[PDB]
Structures are given as C-alpha cells and as structure tokens.
Design a protein around this ligand. Structure first.
Ligand SMILES: O=C(O)[C@@H]1C[C@]2(C(=O)O)C=C[C@@H](O)[C@@H](C2)O1
Length: 104
C-alpha cells in the first residue's frame, strides 16, 4: 500500500550488521530471516510491475557492506562473499515462491 518495500530493506539492515558481527562478539546465521522478506518482497514486486531480479539493489548492498566492513574491521572480502550467498537463496526462492502462488 505504501513504501512497504522500503521498511523491508530496513529490517535486512538490522540483520546485515548481525552477520558482520559489529558490537556482538559472536553471531548466528539466520537464512530464514533473509528468505522471509524474500518471498514477501516478491509479492510487492509483482504489484510493482517489474522483474523479480534487481542487481542495482545488490550493487547498492555491496557498497553498504564495505562501509560497515571497515567500521568493525572484522573482515573484508570474506564478509562480502557471505552476503552474496544470502542473496542467491533470496532470489532462488523468490522466483519459486511467486511461481508456486500462480499455480494455486
Ligand atoms: O528486490 C528486493 O527487495 C528483493 C530482496 C533482495 C534482497 O535479498 O535483499 C534485493 C534486491 C533484489 O535483487 C531481490 C533480493 O529481491
């Protein structure tokens, strides 16, 4: 109904710092969280009349992780490689999710 897709990417930001381990010394991986917004966003995408895939967004995140990476100086390339893995499963189930809803 409104910038609902925007608030969704804001939640991912809270998860982005968590996987980069900023203030919390240890952290667990939450694939479900990323997968969640993944299908919910796919819906809004169909109502936005645009392709499910969207690199630009992925490119924007690349610059976002680099900034937090230097901040907590936890790592560099290793951190970026992990995020890409989260996006892969995000796109994969995104298309399968929208396709499974069209069947019903
Ligand atoms: O458009 C979207 O909002 C969703 C989420 C996504 C992500 O996982 O952050 C970011 C951008 C798009 O490539 C995909 C993956 O769909």
């Amino acid at each position: 109904m409104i910038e609902k897709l925007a608030e969704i990417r804001k939640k991912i930001d809270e998860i982005d710092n968590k996987i980069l381990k900023a203030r919390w010394p240890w952290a667990e991986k939450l694939i479900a969280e990323r997968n969640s917004l993944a299908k919910d966003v796919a819906e809004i995408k169909n109502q936005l009349g645009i392709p499910i895939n969207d690199p630009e967004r992925e490119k924007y995140i690349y610059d976002r992780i680099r900034k937090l990476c230097k901040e907590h100086n936890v790592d560099e390339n290793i951190g970026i490689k992990i995020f890409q893995r989260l996006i892969e499963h995000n796109k994969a189930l995104q298309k399968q999710y929208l396709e499974e809803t069209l069947e019903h």
